[PDB]
Amino acid sequence: AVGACVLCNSQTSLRCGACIRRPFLCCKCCYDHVISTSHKLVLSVNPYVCNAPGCDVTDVTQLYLGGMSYYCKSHKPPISFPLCANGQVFGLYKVTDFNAIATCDWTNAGDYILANTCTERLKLFAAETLKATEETFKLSYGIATVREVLSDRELHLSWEVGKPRPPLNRNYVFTGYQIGEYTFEKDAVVYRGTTTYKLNVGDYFVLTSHTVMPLSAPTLVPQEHYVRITGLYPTLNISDEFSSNVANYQKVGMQKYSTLQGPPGTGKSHFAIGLALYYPSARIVYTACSHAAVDALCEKALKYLPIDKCSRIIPARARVECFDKFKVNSTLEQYVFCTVNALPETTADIVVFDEISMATNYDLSVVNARLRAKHYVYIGDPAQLPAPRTLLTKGTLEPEYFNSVCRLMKTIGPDMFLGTCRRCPAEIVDTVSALVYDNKLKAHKDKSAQCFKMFYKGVITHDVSSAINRPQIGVVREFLTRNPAWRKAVFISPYNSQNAVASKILGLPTQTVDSSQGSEYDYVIFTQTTETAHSCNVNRFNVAITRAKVGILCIMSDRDLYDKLQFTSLEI
Ligand SMILES: [Zn+2]
Ligand SMILES: [Zn+2]
Ligand SMILES: [Zn+2]
């Protein structure tokens, strides 16, 4: 009941009872909150409610202190002081942005803008409030009870009446009942259990609504610049492979934290693993939000670092299959690879946090709270995809608002920029360089002459809201017969339902733009599917076309992005 004010740190007995996170507010800030919002319940040792029997007055502006008790206007004794007066709320030890965070529903883009432009303590309040709001929203959907089991990978579902049905994609993970976590894909539906189980008829699945823990550590520690490399000991014998990053590795040791913007295929994992070879005695914890980002870092370390000093931390509540070649859960190995949600309480000489566009401020804070390091390196690309914000429906979230790190990279610029793309044919590099990198990305490869674009609106159908464009898939099928080398292409689209249809019609392996991030393929076939804000998002468009090493076929819906593609146009 006694704590510190989330706005000015002043000690107080007051917490806001109307705030979902119940933050400690001092007399000054508590007043400026209750007097400007619908929030009127104030909590101390005892709540600020009228003590008079059977009285329901709980509004602090309608209450007074009579002796050492609280009463409303109808029950106060002659000698009483208002609880709200002179810009203060009574209590021991005697804000426009805080009000908006405290009262918003997190459905507008402006809510996320504020959560990232506010002061550091308000970024944690915002991140805690958003996460709790997202989980209290997880109690709103309807239960799915299995009507029948068709096979080992297919079933029919019976949904709860009155409550909405949640989007059936890999994004939403249900906990089966505890028969393990399970996912779904589209009356026949495809079931994917984390644990193999004889799907009982009648057994139900419900979305995991986990408890949101409070945040203590800032999203970014206060920056410190040094005159010499601190706590790290460089090699003089550094492999020529990593020579291009020596000045940047030295910058890493001369700052508390550093940001690295690495466009697709510019050498982010190479830089991260080369940091270990540059400071050979340094203990490095490699972290990212997803198991896939952590696994890609593991694959790079397997090729350059001693396997006996590596360890992959895997949580006991295993959801997906991940990296198997390092010793598991050895927290004290020199190189620790672990997702943010599974990080142990440890220290390190360097912490490398990869795929930074996918981090939230909640993740940034958790990393600072579990890992106490000499240096923190943030690697990613603000021109790539952010974490899905399930509550956000109105407006688009710009890159400078993804998290604190992305805000810095878009405002003051990143500390380090990898400006040469080694993956993509020049047609793709020239396109994304002009689109999202202010013409600063350069192509290492020549033009492949295997990058094609076709403007074909087709016909848009919908599986609920997830879109399908069968004529765009038909155009691809026609192209494949005439271009058999493309038989080995990966089919990519902004929609899971478009991918499901293309998987059955084309037989190509399938990937959404969002699940393709961090991966690369020789050939990519991309169907835009629709002209929505989702399919036209320039970051999503950037990720989609930079998956290709050799060739890409883009079947476009949007004239704008089609005209921007520096590809050979095709006809049909
Ligand atoms: Zn205060
Ligand atoms: Zn409040
Ligand atoms: Zn009363």
From Swiss-Prot:
Mutagenesis / variant outcome for changing residue 240 to Y: In strain: Epsilon/B.1.427/B.1.429
Chemical reaction(s) catalysed: ATP + H2O = ADP + phosphate + H(+)
Occurrences of domain (+)RNA virus helicase C-terminal (ranges): 419-572
LRR repeat start and end residues: 208-228
Localization: Host endoplasmic reticulum-Golgi intermediate compartment
Annotated consequence of substituting residue 36 to P: In strain: Omicron/BQ.1.1, Omicron/XBB.1.5, Omicron/EG.5.1
All residue ranges annotated as the CV ZBD domain in the record: 1-105
Residue sites binding Zn(2+) 12 per the record: 16, 19, 33, 39
Result for mutant: residue 77 to L: In strain: Delta/B.1.617.2
Binding partners and assembly: Interacts with nsp8 to form the replication-transcription complex (RTC): nsp12, nsp7, two subunits of nsp8, and up to two subunits of nsp13. Interacts with host TBK1; this interaction inhibits TBK1 phosphorylation and decreases by 75% IRF3 phosphorylation, which leads to reduced IFN-beta production.
Function: Plays a role in viral RNA synthesis. Multi-functional protein with a zinc-binding domain in N-terminus displaying RNA and DNA duplex-unwinding activities with 5' to 3' polarity. Activity of helicase is dependent on magnesium. Binds to host TBK1 and inhibits TBK1 phosphorylation; the interaction with TBK1 decreases IRF3 phosphorylation, which leads to reduced IFN-beta production.
Protein name as annotated: Helicase nsp13
Organism expressing this protein natively: Severe acute respiratory syndrome coronavirus 2
